[PDB]
Amino acid sequence: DLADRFAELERRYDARLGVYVPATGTTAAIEYRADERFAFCSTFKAPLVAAVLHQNPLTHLDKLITYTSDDIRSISPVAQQHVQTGMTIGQLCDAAIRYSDGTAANLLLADLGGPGGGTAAFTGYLRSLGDTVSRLDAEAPELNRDPPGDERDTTTPHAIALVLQQLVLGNALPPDKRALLTDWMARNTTGAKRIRAGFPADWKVIDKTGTGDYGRANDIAVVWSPTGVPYVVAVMSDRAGGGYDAEPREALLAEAATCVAGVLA
Numbered sequence: 001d002l003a004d005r006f007a008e009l010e011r012r013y014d015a016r017l018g019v020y021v022p023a024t025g026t027t028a029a030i031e032y033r034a035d036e037r038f039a040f041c042s043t044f045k046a047p048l049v050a051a052v053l054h055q056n057p058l059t060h061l062d063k064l065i066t067y068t069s070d071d072i073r074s075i076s077p078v079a080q081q082h083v084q085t086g087m088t089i090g091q092l093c094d095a096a097i098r099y100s101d102g103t104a105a106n107l108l109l110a111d112l113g114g115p116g117g118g119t120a121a122f123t124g125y126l127r128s129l130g131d132t133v134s135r136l137d138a139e140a141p142e143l144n145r146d147p148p149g150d151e152r153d154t155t156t157p158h159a160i161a162l163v164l165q166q167l168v169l170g171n172a173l174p175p176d177k178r179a180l181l182t183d184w185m186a187r188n189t190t191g192a193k194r195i196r197a198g199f200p201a202d203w204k205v206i207d208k209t210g211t212g213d214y215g216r217a218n219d220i221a222v223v224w225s226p227t228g229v230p231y232v233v234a235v236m237s238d239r240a241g242g243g244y245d246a247e248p249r250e251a252l253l254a255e256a257a258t259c260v261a262g263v264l265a
């Protein structure tokens with residue numbers, strides 16, 4: 001029983017775990033706390049890049065964005081390095097997805113524009129995909145810091161999986177922009193120990209991770225079986241019981257993913 005296994009993992013890691021895999025032709029939806037809110041953390045950067053792609057001609061990726069010392073306020077492995085030269089929108093999308101770059105994401109929110117530094121337009125984009133649940137209220141670093149239970153900067157495993165399904169597998173984006181998003185997620189450097197670790201090597205995994213305070217660790221993926229059957233996998237967790245400084249536990253997501261992969265194989 002999957003629910004028993006998921007509950008066991010919660011006890012093991014003193015965590016709250018959320019899992020959603022949307023139904024397919026022959027598989028029923030997999031759901032565990034799937035309609036409970038969890039912080040986005042960096043997982044928002046996948047639909048964010050899609051919003052930026054959608055909003056602009058493809059050649060907007062070649063526009064150089066300049067930024068300064070006071071723009072670096074969060075983990076920004078790429079943007080810290082190019083602060084002196086600037087970065088193109090294309091480079092920013094790359095950094096945001098593949099390195100979970102916080103400054104890159106903040107700059108992409110600014111590019112999207114409008115109230116709240118782009119957070120309202122981001123949320124508006126999710127609404128256009130029929131997501132009436134998720135909300136983004138702050139940028140990095142604030143978005144990772146909301147108290148457990150607080151609805152600011154949250155999604156649910158159910159909501160984000162349906163968003164990702166439309167972006168990667170559905171028609172939310174034209175094929176050319178869809179490929180850009182897909183490729184970036186395919187080349188992600190941060191997800192080796194999460195959903196990827198739970199699926200056999202002959203399954204293709206593309207993903208976007210999130211990590212935050214109160215032991216928050218998320219991963220949203222699209223996976224393909226060895227015969228090219230796709231599934232969307234959203235795993236979210238927090239550890240409120242350790243307080244603000246609770247260590248995120250990647251191993252929990254790898255184990256949850258292993259359990260999911262066992263059902264889907």
Ligand SMILES: *C(=O)[C@@H](NC(=O)[C@H](O)c1ccccc1)[C@@H]1NC(C(=O)O)=C(CSc2nnnn2C)CS1
Nearest residue numbers: 041042043074075100102144190209210211212213
């Ligand atoms: C997006 O979630 C973003 N998270 C943060 O900036 C958090 O505030 C945070 C910082 C330090 C430690 C924990 C949380 C960034 N995204 C991610 C991610 O997606 O995983 C991380 C995880 S750390 C990482 N990245 N690659 N390899 N490791 C390990 C922190 S920055």
